[PDB]
Every structure is written in C-alpha cells, then in structure tokens.
Design a protein around this ligand. Structure first.
Ligand code: NA
Lengths: 9, 100, 273
C-alpha cells in the first residue's frame, strides 16, 4: 500500500 | 557526481543440461546512475528478444536489473552477456560458464 | 519470523526527452508485489494482491500520481539547492516502509532519500526527527519541521503500513511465510597440478539472506574466499556460491558451512570425489 508523499524536498 | 560501475553475473535459472529448456540470466548490479545497456549473446550475436526486471535498487542505493531469456543449452553454442554503462570505456563481455 | 514492506522509488530527469521518469516498486521481503511506472503504456507483481478491489487500486494509483508530481518538483528544487545547470540528468531515490516482528507489531519504520546516489535526508528511528546530510538537506529539514511532516510519516508507518503488511502476510501466507532451503553441492576444478578450486553452491533458496563460508581446519577463510553477490534465479528463488583455492590433496581439510532460515540447522559440506 503506497504512501502518497505530499511534501517534496 | 559519483558513479558506480556494474557488477555482472551470467548464469542459468536451473543447473544446465544440454537439450533441456532453461533460462539464461544476466544480472547487473551495484551501478549508478541507472542507464545501462545489456545484451545476451548467442555465438557472438545479440539475442533479439530478451526480458528484464523492473528497475530497483539495494540499501546502498545502487541499482540492479535481471535480464533473461528462455533457451535450450547445447554443447557447442556459446552464450555471453554484453554490458555498457557510462562508467565503461567500451562494452564489457562476460561469457556464460556453467561452473559459475 | 520478521517481515518487511518497502517501496523503492526512482525519479530520473532526462532533459530533451520529456518529464522525469518515475518508477515505484513495492516488496514484501524479497517478493516484488507491485510496480508503478510513469512510462507504463497500460497501467493495468503478485497473485495475493489480485483480491484487492477497485477502491484499493484507485487509492494506490492516486498515491503514485502524487509521488510522481512530488518527485518531479523535488528534482527541480534540488538542481537549485546544488547550483546545477538544467542540462544534466539527475536521480532522486527514496525507500520507505515498515518492519514487523513475528507478532506483527512494528519493529521500525523507514523513510529516506538519496540524490545522485548520495544520502540526502532520512527519518530517524524515533520517527520524530531528521538526519540531513548537507546544507541543502538542512533546508528540507527546516521545511519539514515547520510543516510537521514527521508526525504524518509516523502516523502512516505505525498505522497504515503495518496494517497492510499484516494483511498481505495473511493473504500471501503460502509463499510469503514459506522459506525454501538451499539445495547445496560442492564442485572441484583443478587450476594447475598444484592447486584446485572448491566451489560451494547454494541454489533455489528463499528468502535471499544466506551465509556461506569456507573453513580450513575449522578456521574461517574469510580473506581467501571468493563470494559472489546473491543473485535472483528468476522464479522467486536465489543463488550464491563461495570458492576457495586449495593445495592439491588437502581438499578434506576444507568444509563449507551453510546457514539459511529454511534450514533446521547449518549444513556442513565437503567435496566428495
Ligand atoms: Na540533521
């Protein structure tokens, strides 16, 4: 189950 | 930036025996960046149709890929894997050896 | 015993050849169960994932779309952080997921990043603080602290990640919780009149973790042993060998020792002519 990563570098 | 040259292994899925169908594998690993060219050779000639795994990497961030094709080994046919990468001045050929 | 779920994500810019390619590969232990690829011609891997419904896939595909956009934006910001030109190709990788123990409780969480093959930032084991590799990553750290990103990552890792890994382990029990022991043999090849190679083989094993060693008179030959990297067979299983060069006639002083989860206890092998 994929984490949706909303914050970038 | 930093670059890592591929390690290369050429081998069969199952122990090789002449006349019995098998898979020929070329495993490339430990490399960076990810762009890489891999060919399987039969008697020096590129096998036109080969499959590969989905790009992934190890805990140390280095990439790996498995290239493979179905084949039936015989006593005379020679197989090899030919690999090129930015780290390599020219393509590197590794011969299939049944004992490795 | 213990199990892990991990996603390995790679974003790679390619100036002049479109937007950066993004690929995300998910694993339970050494079994790949899913792949999302921005270059996939048709979006529609493991059998136990097949029972998941359309709602599961809707949510996963949305997450992939978000990650594609997030990583493409990160690649753009990273070029700035390192004063790089817009002409070269660069790579952003991340790994994240959870490890659980035999009882299925969280053992630890993971969320880390590398840029052009170098560690950039990572979520600490406490799931509350960051370790930044350089002054660029310190910027990300500042922003992530201000936005309470770790609190959200801790939430996923302790809840959702573990919940789904437990579910996959339950549905995929027959393969995910089955260890296949190595099939082992020793071969012997003279390299001259005076020396020969003994090669200790392990084939058909799962999972990949294995220990192969040679001993001479009960002493480990770490320095003299050639060890190849563990390699995939193509059919779920893995292979490995270890070789030593021995003086002709001294072969019986050498023993190969094999340790693997699928083995009740270590094997001890010798060349048998
Ligand atoms: Na830090």
């Amino acid at each position: 189950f994929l984490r949706g990563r909303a914050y970038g570098l | 930036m930093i670059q890592r040259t591929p390690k290369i292994q050429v081998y069969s899925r199952h122990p090789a025996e002449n006349g019995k169908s098998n898979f020929l594998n070329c495993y490339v690993s430990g490399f960076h960046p990810s762009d890489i060219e891999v060919d399987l050779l039969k008697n020096g000639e590129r096998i036109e149709k080969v499959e590969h795994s989905d790009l992934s990497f190890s805990k140390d961030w280095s990439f790996y890929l498995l290239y493979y094709t179905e084949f039936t080994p015989t006593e005379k046919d020679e197989y090899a894997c030919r690999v090129n990468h930015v780290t390599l001045s020219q393509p590197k050929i590794v011969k299939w050896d049944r004992d490795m | 015993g213990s199990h892990s779920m991990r996603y390995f994500d790679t974003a790679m810019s390619r100036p002049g050849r479109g937007e950066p390619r993004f690929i995300s590969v998910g694993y339970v232990d050494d079994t790949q169960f899913v792949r999302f690829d921005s270059d996939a011609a048709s979006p529609r891997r493991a059998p136990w994932i097949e029972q998941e419904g359309p709602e599961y896939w809707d949510r996963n595909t949305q997450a992939f779309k978000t990650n594609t956009q997030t990583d493409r934006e990160s690649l753009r910001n990273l070029r700035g952080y390192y004063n790089q030109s817009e002409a070269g190709s660069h790579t952003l990788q991340s790994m994240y997921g959870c490890d659980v123990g035999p009882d299925g409780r969280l053992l630890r969480g993971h969320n880390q990043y590398a840029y052009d093959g170098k560690d950039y930032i990572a979520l600490n084991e406490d799931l509350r603080s960051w370790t930044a590799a350089d002054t660029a990553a310190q910027i990300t750290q500042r922003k992530w602290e201000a936005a309470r990103v770790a609190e959200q990552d801790r939430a996923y890792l302790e809840g959702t990640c573990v919940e789904w890994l437990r579910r996959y382990l339950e549905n995929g029990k027959d393969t995910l919780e089955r260890a296949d022991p190595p099939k082992t043999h020793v071969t012997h090849h003279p390299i001259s009149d005076h020396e020969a190679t003994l090669r200790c083989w392990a084939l058909g094993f799962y999972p990949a973790e294995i220990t192969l060693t040679w001993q001479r008179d009960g002493e480990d030959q770490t320095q003299d042993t050639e060890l190849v990297e563990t390699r995939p067979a193509g059919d779920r299983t893995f292979q490995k060998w270890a070789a030593v060069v021995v003086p002709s006639g001294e072969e019986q002083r050498y023993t190969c020792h094999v340790q693997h989860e699928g083995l009740p206890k270590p094997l001890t092998l010798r060349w048998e002519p």
